[PDB]
Symmetry: D2
Subunit: 101 residues, 4 copies
Amino acid sequence: MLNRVVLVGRLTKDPELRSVNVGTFTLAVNRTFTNAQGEREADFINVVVFKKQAENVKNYLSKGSLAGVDGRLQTRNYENKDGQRVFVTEVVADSVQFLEP
Amino acid sequence: MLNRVVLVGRLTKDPELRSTPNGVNVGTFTLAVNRTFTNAQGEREADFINVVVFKKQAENVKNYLSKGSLAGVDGRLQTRNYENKDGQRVFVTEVVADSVQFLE
Amino acid sequence: MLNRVVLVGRLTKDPELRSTPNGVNVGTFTLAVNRTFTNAQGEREADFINVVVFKKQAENVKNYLSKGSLAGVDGRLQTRNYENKDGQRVFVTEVVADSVQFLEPK
Amino acid sequence: MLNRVVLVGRLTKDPELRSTPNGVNVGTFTLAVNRTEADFINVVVFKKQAENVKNYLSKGSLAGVDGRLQTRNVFVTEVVADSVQFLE
């Protein structure tokens, strides 16, 4: 079934590599509208990359970089230290685009 | 900034409709999108995505969609975070649908 | 740069298979995807989008899909331009599909 | 049925102004999207958003587009945009 996600945003932090081996960062995607006082909210979207795509993100992207992301939405579920269940939704990037020279 | 999500899937359960303290309709359902590839043993697994609609979009999805209905969703990916009963910080990301298309 | 198209529609005709100078099979069909809004005349028009598939995916669409089959298409949008006898130009726009989903039974 | 197109590229010229028979304003530009050789995709915007694009974007500017795909006739298919997002 069809599953497609496209985002442009800026990384909140420097990307992490993680593992089997996965590259990870979170993208702040400003909304296109504001309230009457110009306050603009954002969404903080976790993205995961693999292989050379994971390598490209590690060598090009840093805190604050504007990036383009194209992928699938995948959901998983785990339990943590305190004994709580966490519901995870993320973008698994099929192609990431560095939008800055 | 660009924010676009398009999915096709089937509802896992029947949709729920509600009215905020302010009296606008909010519709909720979860969409199961089978993957296009297979896992290490040849299984095709699914993803279970929470979708949100408002206003007439929420009404029409409530009266027309039921458990198992094939639907296409066009919208944006939005993130929230709250502190629920047990006392947890819970991070929710969900699809806010600009248009739901009844495919059956 | 990002280039992304997601469509659902019904095939206008039955799909075509062909095999290039090299051997690879190329699948061809065009999709009628009705608009979500209405015209000044109160009913619903569609847009007719050419789709291109390759390799085994193109085989399946030839073996499974027919005129009227509802299908979903995911891919990238391509533009090229070439000619013919009247050596003047044909402007083609199409979607080359990364994945097709057959939304009806067969 | 679903019809969504999302691109990022650069305008080949400055966007143009124009209006329909019924006086509605239209802004056009063609978008040079890069493969990863380019694709050259015409984009249409409407009403006030045409005033937006004409002020914000010029030849070479990096814009993202989000919208529907539409056919017209001389066959022509364009991207009717729901929002152009000025990135540079």
